[PDB]
Design a protein around this ligand. Structure first.
Ligand code: ZN
Ligand code: ZN
Lengths: 46, 335, 67, 101, 150, 49, 97, 48
């Protein structure tokens, strides 16, 4: 959710330290995305 | 001439307005008025909520063309345009999503707004009576009730198909008090804005400015408005019988009409036909019938986007042009 | 991905009808245009997108992040 | 009062009424196609056309030519003020019949 | 793949001429033919026999006012944020290597590996762009890797 | 050496001999500045020349 | 050529000089140069420009002309069976120049 | 060949700017009526 990133398969939210671990907690799976901010953004529809 | 247009199998005839005392020995049809007025007429087809249709007579193509044009472009209509968002995770490309809401019509009037100024920057741009700002959020929830496998994923998942209905609006100071009996509504509430599944959420507040059609269709008051030229048919000789019965069979059901085996084929009514000019292929029906239309007499109709009553739309587009002239009259002329 | 809100020519609201259309196709076995005939599209330009526009977005949802 | 609206083309006319070429700013076939009609029926006029120089740009050029006497810009005045009256009729009968409905 | 389009054959708008088509605004405005281009950029963070990795840190944020417009745009991690208008001249990913990393190490050290030559890759381009996905992951060889997309 | 016979050995005399280079593909053919590249599309309303 | 400036983005020229480039429009390219020193300008513009170069050297014919539409576009106006109106001719002669 | 190019091409610009604006206003196009011969030439062609 609000926190930093997500698994690939687990879709399990997780946060991480630096030079820490590539694995998530629950997944024996590696790759992970980065969650979208709470920061406001803008488009214009036209 | 004589408001007749040639309809011939490969071609047309007598198109340009050609009435004014430029082009004739005797110089007539020179302007004035009140020959215009008392000759000029108009009629209505029917009046509906989101649609209008009617008929016009005894004017050239031009000014009518104007009404169509300014009607599809230079008339006002207001819509949500600028888009602000409360995150999103969903599948749909968030831009394209914005484009959606950008386009969806609204039922709201002008005249309760003003125009944005390119000047007066920052927050001063979008202000109060000049802006209508919309917010929406849904975080899809799995419906814990699981009747079947693969229902519509509604029984699976609450509020999966998001609608203009799902939009609401936040009124503000002086913004509330005015629309109390004019509840802000998104025209047709039923449109698919997005599809989704729980573990997904979308939230936004976009902004709503007044706009003009020529810049973007999303500012059209109208789905489409056009004038079909009123059809006419001249017929010759009795030519009655099954052959004549074949004749009307050459046209859509409105066509002509048949009183009897005798009394040949009489026009039932015009304006039902598509002006689809088939008869000239069968080559027998030719010499008794010519096809054409009257440049004075305009079938003219319009779709309301749901914006407002099109009768008043059309009425507006007229005045908008009247203005456009007037502003030009007493505007001075530099050399 | 989605029913486009309006057709590329008419610009009548299309979106409303896609749902109800598919409803009229699944239940009530009936002919395509004849459906749209009483569904309120009398002009082909609009009509194509109802006859057209394969609906992908669900075929995408298979790959949704949470699965 | 805005002084960028119609900038008369000097090179167009010779002298004294006669002919003139005009550029109307931010305007198009909606007007021009209309206006040319209302103009052309004014007897003294000869030649009133219009066109866009380029669609990619927005300027509208209306050309006017006449016999002697009455001036071009005077003619444009008259015909335009007449197009006013046309609108006056359109509302006059339209809203009337529809008020009756 | 394509658009099912309403087409007329005519000479209209004499721009037509040879093979040149011509379109309708407030159609393309209504949407039509609209495109998206997913591109990608990849960065291999490679460690060094100097026993010194490469650092992704960043986001200096002067004045307390804002992360500098030359940079900005990333996030607390110091890396490109999901779904942000991102513009030429700026950085969606910050890669930095040490300057002593290039040379022959010895097992004699005290404090500072802290020298970092940074080569944050600018996104060049003729127009705005967005970042909807970024990936922190590793290959077989156990070294950090970031492959992102615009 | 490595003994793989890569190919890549000549190219001093061959430098100014064929294809793109010093012969007549670079010097007689010099690559140019102050330029641009695009595609085409009409404007009849644009005057000739 | 002389240089004019417009919006959007692409090279746009007038059609009668297509055939010299043997330009098909279609999807093809061009390249764009400007001189630097003054004398180069006066050189190419008043010599190697169009209006002086209008004829091909080989057979000594004008290579530039109406092509496709403009050709046939004339024919329709050119056509005998046609006729026009003082208003029609008016707006035409406008549209021509 | 008579008056020199400056007014010569000045014609051709007028050529284009005319045609490009008119033709579309008037209009023209192909038709299947054109490519498909109506009766006739199929039969005579058959002997041909
Ligand atoms: Zn996991
Ligand atoms: Zn349509």
């Amino acid at each position: 959710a609000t926190l930093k990133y997500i698994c690939a398969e687990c879709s399990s939210k997780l946060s991480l330290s630096r030079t820490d671990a590539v694995r998530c907690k629950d997944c024996g799976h590696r790759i992970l995305l980065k969650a979208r901010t709470k920061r406001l953004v803008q488009f214009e529809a036209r | 001439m004589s408001n007749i247009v040639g309809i011939e199998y490969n071609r047309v005839t007598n198109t340009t307005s050609t009435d004014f005392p430029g082009f004739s020995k005797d110089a007539e049809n020179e302007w004035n008025v009140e020959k215009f007025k008392k000759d000029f007429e108009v009629n209505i087809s029917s009046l509906d909520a989101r649609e209008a249709n009617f008929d016009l007579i005894n004017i050239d193509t031009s000014i009518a063309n104007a009404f169509r044009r300014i009607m599809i472009s230079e008339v006002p209509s207001v819509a949500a345009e600028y888009v602000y968002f409360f995150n999103n995770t969903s599948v749909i490309q968030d831009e394209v999503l914005a484009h959606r809401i950008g386009l969806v019509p609204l039922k709201v009037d002008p005249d309760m707004l003003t125009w944005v100024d390119s000047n007066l920057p920052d927050d001063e741009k979008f202000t109060d009576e000049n802006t209508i700002v919309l917010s929406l959020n849904v975080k899809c929830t799995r419906n814990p009730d699981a009747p079947k496998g693969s229902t519509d994923p509604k029984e699976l998942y609450n509020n999966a198909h998001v609608y203009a209905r799902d939009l609401k609006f936040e009124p503000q100071g002086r913004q509330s008090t005015t629309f109390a009996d004019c509840p802000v509504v998104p025209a047709d509430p039923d449109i698919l804005l997005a599809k989704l599944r729980p573990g997904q959420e979308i939230s936004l507040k976009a902004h709503c400015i007044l706009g003009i059609g020529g810049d973007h269709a999303k500012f059209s008051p109208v789905s489409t408005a056009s004038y079909r030229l009123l059809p006419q048919i001249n017929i010759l000789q009795p030519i009655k019988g099954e052959s004549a019965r074949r004749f009307q069979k050459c046209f859509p059901p409105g066509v002509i009409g048949i009183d009897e085996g005798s009394d040949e084929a009489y026009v039932k009514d015009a304006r039902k036909d598509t002006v689809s000019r088939e008869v000239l292929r069968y080559e027998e029906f030719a010499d008794k019938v010519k096809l054409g239309r009257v440049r004075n007499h305009f079938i003219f109709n319009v779709e309301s986007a749901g914006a407002m009553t099109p009768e008043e739309i059309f009425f507006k587009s007229v005045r908008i042009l009247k203005n456009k002239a007037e502003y030009l009259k007493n505007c001075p002329i530099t050399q | 991905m989605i029913v486009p809100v309006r057709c590329f020519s008419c610009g009548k609201v299309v979106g409303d009808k896609w749902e109800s259309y598919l409803n009229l196709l699944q239940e009530d076995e009936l002919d395509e245009g004849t459906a749209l005939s009483r569904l309120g599209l009398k002009r082909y330009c609009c009509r194509r997108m109802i006859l057209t526009h394969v609906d992908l977005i669900e075929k995408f949802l298979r790959y949704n992040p949470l699965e | 009062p805005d002084r960028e609206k119609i900038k008369l083309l000097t090179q167009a006319t010779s002298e004294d009424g006669t002919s003139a070429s005009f550029q109307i700013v931010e305007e198009d076939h909606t007007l021009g196609n209309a206006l040319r009609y209302v103009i052309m029926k004014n007897p003294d006029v000869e030649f009133c056309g219009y066109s866009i120089p380029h669609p990619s740009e927005n300027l509208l050029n209306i050309r006017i030519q006449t016999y002697g006497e009455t001036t071009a810009v005077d003619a444009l005045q008259k015909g335009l003020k007449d197009l006013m009256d046309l609108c006056d009729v359109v509302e006059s009968k339209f809203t009337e019949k529809i008020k009756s409905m | 793949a394509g658009q099912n389009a309403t087409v007329a054959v005519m000479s209209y708008s004499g721009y037509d001429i040879e093979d040149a088509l011509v379109l309708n605004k407030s159609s393309i405005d209504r949407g039509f033919g609209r495109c998206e281009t997913r591109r990608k950029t990849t960065t291999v963070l490679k460690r060094y026999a100097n026993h010194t990795q490469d650092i992704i840190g960043g986001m200096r944020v002067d004045e307390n006012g804002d992360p500098i417009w030359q940079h900005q745009s990333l996030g607390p991690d110091g890396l490109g944020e999901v779904g942000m208008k991102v513009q030429s001249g700026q950085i969606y990913i910050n890669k930095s290597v040490p300057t002593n990393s290039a040379d022959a190490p010895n097992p004699n050290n005290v404090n500072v590996q802290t020298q970092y030559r940074e080569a944050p890759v600018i996104y060049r381009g003729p127009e705005p762009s967005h970042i909807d996905q970024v990936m922190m992951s590793v290959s077989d060889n156990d070294q950090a890797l970031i492959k992102v997309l615009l | 050496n490595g003994g793989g016979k890569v190919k890549p050995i000549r190219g001093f005399c061959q430098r100014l001999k064929g294809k793109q280079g010093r012969f007549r593909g670079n010097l007689s053919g010099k690559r140019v500045d102050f330029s641009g590249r695009t595609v085409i599309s009409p404007d009849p309303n644009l005057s000739i020349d | 050529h002389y240089a004019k400036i417009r919006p959007w983005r692409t090279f746009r020229l007038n059609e009668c000089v297509c055939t010299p480039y043997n330009a098909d429009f279609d999807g093809d390219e061009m390249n764009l140069h400007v001189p630097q020193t003054e004398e180069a300008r006066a050189e190419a513009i008043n010599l190697m420009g169009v209006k002086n170069n209008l004829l091909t050297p080989k057979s000594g014919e004008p290579i530039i002309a109406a092509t496709q539409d403009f050709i046939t576009g004339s024919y329709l106006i050119s056509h005998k069976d046609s006729f026009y109106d003082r208003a029609t001719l008016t707006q035409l002669l406008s549209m021509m120049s | 060949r008579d008056y020199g190019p400056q007014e010569a091409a000045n014609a051709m610009n007028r050529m284009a700017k005319l045609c490009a604006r008119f033709l579309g206003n008037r209009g023209f196009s192909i038709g299947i009526n054109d490519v498909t011969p109506a009766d006739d030439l199929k039969q005579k062609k058959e002997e041909l």
